[PDB]
Ligand SMILES: COc1ccc(C2(c3cc(-c4cn(C)nc4C)[nH]n3)CC2)cc1
């Protein structure tokens with residue numbers, strides 16, 4: 001049975017060129033702009049993502065919610081050699097599409113795709129995937145999971161001082177608990193990046209949250 005996600009991949013494979021991540025991004029955005037809407041794409045958002053990768057030059061990136069691979073392709077194309085992206089996708093068919101998308105784009109050696117739920121996989125990163133700490137986390141999965149998975153990342157020792165969290169859709173449909181927490185906490189230095197959703201004619205935004213280290217115990 002045909003699916004939207006299969007159609008997106010087919011359109012890339014037909015129209016983009018293998019080993020050219022930019023042609024892949026442009027094919028996805030054209031398709032989602034002209035044929036059918038899809039989650040987790042957008043060049044405008046992608047501009048902001050590019051700037052963060054460019055500025056912080058992360059060597060180890062965790063993505064939550066790969067979907068079809070748009071953001072994984074977007075990020076991995078800007079990674080230095082030896083840098084790596086781990087991306088998590090809870091739906092197995094979407095994981096498969098993300099893998100072929102990345103393969104087509106020629107980025108398969110930079111990315112590891114994990115098929116499972118974030119709260120199950122995150123505490124396995126140290127033991128299973130030889131992670132010390134993450135340089136950057138991109139959150140674009142289930143919105144009610146942004147806050148818990150962030151606390152879970154902290155818990156598991158995966159965050160270091162200077163780790164960049166970048167969270168999408170914090171305005172539409174919104175992640176109010178997450179925003180209140182990271183903005184209200186001294187453990188996160190937060191910058192908001194507005195980005196206009198052109199055809200819904202509404203402002204969304206990303207939140208950048210830089211980890212500052214954990215809250216210190218009471219002293220005297
Ligand atoms: C209904 O709104 C949606 C539906 C699907 C998604 C997507 C997603 C979410 C996850 C996920 C959830 N957990 C707990 N862990 C992981 C990993 N993977 N992929 C993007 C495809 C985003 C928003």
Ligand SMILES: [K+]
Nearest residue numbers: 182183185188
């Ligand atoms: K804060």
Ligand SMILES: [Mg+2]
Nearest residue numbers: 040140168169
């Ligand atoms: Mg999204």
